[model samples]
Every structure is written in C-alpha cells, then in structure tokens.
Target chain A: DDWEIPDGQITVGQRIGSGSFGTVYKGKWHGDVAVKMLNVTAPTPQQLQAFKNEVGVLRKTRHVNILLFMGYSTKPQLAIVTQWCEGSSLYHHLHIIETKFEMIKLIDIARQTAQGMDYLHAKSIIHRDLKSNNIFLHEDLTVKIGDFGLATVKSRWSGSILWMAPEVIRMQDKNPYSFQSDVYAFGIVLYELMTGQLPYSNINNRDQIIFMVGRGYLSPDLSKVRSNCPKAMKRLMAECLKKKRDERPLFPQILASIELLARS
Target chain B: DWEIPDGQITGTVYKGKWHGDVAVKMLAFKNEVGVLRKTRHVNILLFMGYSTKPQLAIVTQWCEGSSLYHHLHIIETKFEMIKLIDIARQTAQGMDYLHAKSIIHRDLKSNNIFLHEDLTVKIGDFGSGSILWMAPEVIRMQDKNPYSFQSDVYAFGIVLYELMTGQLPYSNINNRDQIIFMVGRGYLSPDLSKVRSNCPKAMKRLMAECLKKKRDERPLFPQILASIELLARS
Candidate 1:
C-alpha cells in the first residue's frame, strides 16, 4: 500500500520507448524516472489483485545489479516507475551504438549479469526472461538486470523468442521455466554480448527457430562467438546450453566461472 | 548513420547525423531537452539532437571518462593540485551558465560531474542525481522548499571537499538520520583540515562561504568561479 505513489507526484512526459507489453515514458517524481504504462488497460478484479500481490514481492527485491523499482500507480493507467539508466539497454549498446567490447569488459558484463541473477535465484525468484534487451547499463557500464518478476503478471509472455530456452519453447510440459531455463537464456545472452550478434543469426522465421531450438536440434553456434572469448566462458556457455536441464550449472556455479574468468 | 570502429576514429564514439562522434541516450524527456538545448558552454555537455521516431532519445558528443565520483572513489585516481582547482573552475563555469538561465540543478554531486578523456570537467546527469549532496535548507524542508542557485553552490562545496580529500562528506557517520539531523541544524560541516595540507587558505575560505547556513551568505557561481581561477593561477 505504501508502494502506491500519489498520481499527482508523477509528471508523465512524452513516450520514450515501447514494447509489446507497455510504453515507457520519461517522467518526473522528485527526479527523472522511467514510467512504464502496462498494456493491461482494463484489468479484471482478479488481475488487479494478482498484480498487487506480485508488486509486494517486487518491492522487497533489491540488489546493486538490479534496476531499482521506485513505486507504482494504478489510476489513469497501470504504471510502474523505476530508476532511469542513462546508459540504456545492452541491446542498444551492442547493436545500435556498435560499441566494441574488449575481452575483459565482456567478462565483466557477464559477471555482473550473473551476480544479479544469482541474487534473484537466492530469493527463490526467477528471471523468466533474460536477454540483452532486458539488461541495462549505467553510464559507468555497470550491468543491471531489468524486468525482474514482471513475467509473473505477464504470464502468457515468455519474452523474446530468440533468447527463450528450448525447454521454455517446448511448452507441452508444464512449468518449464526453472532456474536452469534462465541459465540457458543467460548463455544465449553471453553469446550475444561476446559476438555482438543475435542468437542464431542465420535463422529468419519464428516457427523454424522454435522447431530447431525446442527439439534441441540447434543452439547458438560456438564458432561464431568472438575469437577472443576465453575458454572458461566458452565452456560456461556450453554447460548452460546443454539440452538436458539437469546438465546446466546454476547461477552460483555460473558466477564462479565468471569470477574465474575475471581473475585469469 | 552507421557506427564506425576505433581504427577509423581515435576512440569508440559512434558516427551519427553529426560529422563527429556522438553518444545517443534513450528515455530522454522533453523538459530535459528543453533545458539542455538552450545551454552552450565549454564545460557543459553539448546536446546534439532529440529524436522522436525509432525510439525517443537524446544525442550528445561522447564523453570518454567516468563520473567525477567514480574517478575519485572507484578508480581512486590521484589528481594534481592545479588540475583539481581547474576542475572546480570548470564546474563553477558550467553551474554559472545554468544559474544565469534560471535553471537550478536540484541535484549536483561528484557523480553528476563527468570528466572527459583529457580530464576536462563537464557537469551532467541533470536528472536522476542523489541526496548526500543536498543542501542544508533542502534537507530540512525535505523538497518542500525549492532548491535555489545557493543550494547548488553548497553541493559544489561538498564536491570540492570530495575532490580535495578523496572521501565522502561525513565519512565517519554511518547513520543517515543523525547525519541529516546534524547537517540540517548546521551542526555538521566538512572538515577543511581533511583537505590536503598543501591546499591554499583562499580555496578553503571560498568553500566555507559557499556552504554558509544562510542561502544569501553563500557566494554566487561567478565569484566562486573567479576565486577558483585565482587558485589555479596561484
């Protein structure tokens, strides 16, 4: 209830960006903030209560590498305000800015991402959607995991198809999204960051990607990962991308490998 | 325009509509652009454009160095006396430009002050700044009273202290409530002696004036800038 921000405090400005779920705006609430207006304009009583329950969980979550959630407003529109990362998303940096990453910097990015995920998993929460697009960077190039816990409210949404785990895609099984599934997506993200290319860059069609990946017939090609990628990172990716979920290492193990890479 | 690799350019700045390298920022709002567009100073970050399509963003020339706070705390970069004073002068100049336009940077701290590749100071991150830098009046009123130019000057004094001592203000105090109470009552102030022993008396005097309890008692940015210039020359 304390998390409910007074509508008057928020001064919503022009729309800054949009996704399938919501339109983000530059807003002011004591200071500059990002206001995301969820697409659920007319929510049912059940949906409203469910969303509030999820917010209860979200308000408790805090980590240095996770985007800070300020508060939310339900009136006018369902909106959530968060700390504005001036450095923007990793997708924007790698694909749009075309910023070249040194091997060390790449490792640092992966390490930070893993640290955030490790923190979340420890709290018994899962970042169902993990991708470069959902990760943010501070001006200092610090990695912050964004869109944490929102997947609970937006259950139908499984996040971007490219980064989706094969198990997640093979939705014939119930509750496919486990900690292992997230690690699978993290591997895809690491591959993307290392190569500055999309996972399965050669693939074009969505159904084809789903079929090839869902059945475990294909994964991001290892050779395409930058030549400078350390052997530890390559191995980490291999372990995460294993078709059998049990074979994949958890975020703690992933963090250990990242630290090892960092020290070496 | 496509982003060019470092071999083509001296650094990793991306090529945009501008001939030179520019960094594009997403989630930029209208009010910030309205303020930034009118500003033009050597010490201020230059605004290049505001785009409405593809995605809302603001473009500006790339700054290769980290924030001043990061430089001092994270990197623990040692700054020469002359260079430190020069940073103070440049920061004052930039802040002076903002005040002249009747703009109050409610938040100004070491973090908001960015450094260039050559260690040139550029005051930035106009939005999303923090509270440790809040002026006494600001902390007391708790955002009810509007922050004035003197407020920014007070923060500048804190930043100057950080630059001098390479530590945070009231580093000894861990409890934020006590710090706020003490500072709001004007009972707490940064220890000038903590500044390096070689620091000139004049610079310390200037910082004292900037941090005066009364807003009217604080010196304006022009005077602050002039005093810093004198310190640099000395």
Candidate 2:
C-alpha cells in the first residue's frame, strides 16, 4: 500500500534553494519520506554521476552525522528520498540566532561534522562542496552533512570555488582535491561558526578570493573574537588555514585536535 | 687517431647574451679537426644518434631568442621574472617532450640558449657532453663508458644552478676544472636563503631540488618538468 505514491503528484511544500545547477522542491513520498525533485535539464552527466555516487556512498555509510538516503528514482523524474529534517539548514539557524553559539554547542556541531567527514574520507570519497547551506540540522541539534550532488568517488573534477581550500585553488588540475583539501574547507566552516562571517568577506570576487586564499589571507582578526572562542579551537583553525598543502593538518589529525579542544 | 681535446678551453666571446639551455662553442675533436659545436636542445632539439662518419657531426636547428638565463638575470626582476616563469615552464615542457621520446640532453647549460617572442625557451644540447669533453680518457672510456644517464642530471644541476644565481657554479674556473670539479664535488647545493633574494621562493626551491648533489637526490627530469610546469601555471 505504501509503494503506490503515483505519478503526476504535484503536491507543493516549500522551496528550499535555487542555483544554476537545479532547484529542490520539498514533497512527500510513501506517506512518511521527504522527496527532493531535481530539474532534469540542469543536472549534467557529471552531476548525475555524482548523484548516483552519493546514493552508493550514503547507502554504504552508517553514521549519525551523515544524511540517510531512503531511495532515489531516476525514471519518471529525478528525485532523491531522504528522512526529512524538521528544522532547516544550519545556514538559516546561524543567521537567526542572536547570540553566538556557546562553546558546548559549537563543539557538538564540530564533532558531528568531523565524524561525517571522517566517514566520507575513510571511503576515499570527497564531498567536494561543504557549506553551511549543505549542513542540515534536527531539533535535537544533531547535524548531518548533505548535498553530495557534487561529491565524487574517484575525484571527478568538482568543487565550489568560494569554499575551496588553498591547495584546490593553487593546484587546480594536479589532483589537489584530496582529503586534505576537504580539511581546508572544514577549517573555513570552523572559522564561520566561530566568527559568524565567511572567510575573506572583504574580497567577494571569485578571482580575488582565489588570490587571497593563495596569498595566505587569514580571516578577519580572530583576536577580536578570541574571548568567545577557545584558544585551542583558534589554533586548530590556524593549522587548517596553512598556506601550503603539505603544512595543513590531515583530517584524522584535525579530528584528534578537535577532540582535544573539546576536552579542554 | 682522433683523441678528443680535454682540459680548459677558454673564450672571451661570451657576454650578456641570454642562452637558456643552449650554449654554443667551437672545439676540435682529435686535436685539430675543427667542428662548430652547439649545445643540444633537450626538448626542442632532435637527436641523430651516434655518427659513424670520420668527422662526426651532431646538427641541431637554431632556436632563436633570449636565453632563460638572460631573461631572468638582465631584465628588471618584477615584470621580467613573471614573464620568465612562463618561459621556464615552456622550456621544461620541451624537456618533457624529449623525455617522452626517450632522449636526454647530456649537457644542459645556460649558453646553450634560445628564446622565441612567444616566451618559449628552446633547449638545444643533446649528446654533446661527450663531444665537448672528448679528452683521451673520455674517448678511451667510450668502450667502457663512465658517463651514465646520471651525467645528464649532473649537467641539469649546473643549468639550474646558473638559472638560480645568474652566475655559473664554476664561472671563476676554466672549463676542464669546472667539469672535473662538477664531476667530483657535484653541482652547488641549492641555498634557498640565497636564491630567494633574487628569485621567487617556489621557483628557487624547485631549482634547488633540481641541482641536488646526488643524482638520486635529484628528481627525474620528468618529475622536475611536471612540477615546474605546475608552478608555472599556478
């Protein structure tokens, strides 16, 4: 009885986000599951492969921090089913919260993120795109890293230029999109959570952002936001922002550092 | 008997000319048989293999332009070196082409230089090291060769050393002593602190690694070529 959701079911819910790539529409599937309908023409072969890869990756992954893939449909319409989050993206939440996140809340979110990233990296898969918008949260403050539409199983040339790490910017073609590159992006996420600002907001132009990242531009002085931010957390962010790929901390090392920071 | 000339061969003709990897010279193999010798372009130059003729000729076409040495050294540092990085990258690319073809430039020196307006550094010297060093010892040892593929690496180190410093490692010494000393003491170790004063730190580090003393310490020409190519683009 649950199998029959039927075609031409145009039930409208909420418009979550839009981009040149595609749009996501919130809809119900099999009575309990949330379905995301993707615009067909917008998804390229690379994107489609990424979508399939994400299904495979998520199917194999069993972690609290990663979104669970219920099922996906390639025919009739390209749609992905996931257990719906009652709360929206962490992006909107961060903007809505008047006070900065407390150390405990920040650490909880950070730990969940690390666990999710660790799972992906362990499988030799790169999320490629990591942003507040892609991170979904539940009412219990649980976080799940989502938006694997850009993820790749074999480093299939994908990245969001803005959130790209220094190595990704510098060595764009030389297979620089590794786990270490993800660590660099993770560092930016950490920076965002701590300071409530995107990295290098003064220079919003893509090329300028690239140059700023390449030239080792540090996000706005952490010193001003130091009291609210833990010293260990600050140091961890610094290590992640290292100008050279060889200098940046690996994900495991970063995870260990985060655990250490949390304990202190 | 054609016993090749050995020992220091000096000339006052060399000056501010920017020879990248190709340096030209006039030398006699077997005492007085005059030959107009040009450095082989590793990337751009084609190898004809061993010549069996009485007077052996290794002919490579001319790659006309300023040498990478002159471009990096003579021109103003800021504007010129940026342009020079492009040239160096293209030159390494030429080397990549040669490596792919299984040919190696036994002698990579500054005077063996040429440049195009398009900022392409055409490497010229291939298989001329043994010719330039045609001493009796070298000629006799040909039957039981002393120069391995590593010799070319040594020569590459010298070329890189010159590129970094704008001064050849043995400029103060004559050719025989320089070659002998290089063969003995090896090319100068890359000093990043000293090199960074003139060249970009990344470029300097790359050149330094190319000029490492041990052949094993030196990366394969292909690896060097790839790294430099990446740096150039980056």
- Model 2, position A182, has a per-residue lDDT of 78
Candidate 1 chain A weakest ten by summed lDDT: A150-159
Q: What is the lDDT of residue B217 in candidate 2?
A: 41
Which stretches of model 1 miss by more than 4 angstroms? A156-159, B1-234
The residue ranges of model 2 lying beyond 4 angstroms of the native Cα positions read A1-12, A42-54, A96-99, A150-160, A217-220, B1-234
lDDT by residue for model 2 over A174-206, one digit each (tens)?
A: 566766677778877787788776555566577
Model 1 lDDT vs. the true structure? 0.79
lDDT of 1 by residue, B20-111 (tens): 77666655256666667678898888876666565455667877778888989998999898888888888999998988888888888887
Docking class of 1: incorrect
Q: What is the TM-score of chain A alone in each candidate?
A: 0.95, 0.82
Highest lDDT against the true fold, candidate: 1
Worst 10 residues of 2 chain B by lDDT: B8-17
lDDT of 1 by residue, A1-264 (tens): 778997888999889888878899999997989999999979878888887888887887788898889998888788889988787788888888888878888889898999999999889888888889889989888888888757678865334877777778889777788888898889888888877888766777788888988898888888888877888688778877877664566675577667755877
In model 2 chain A, where is the ten-residue run with the lowest total lDDT?
A: A1-10
Sorted into a CAPRI-style docking class, model 2 comes out as: incorrect
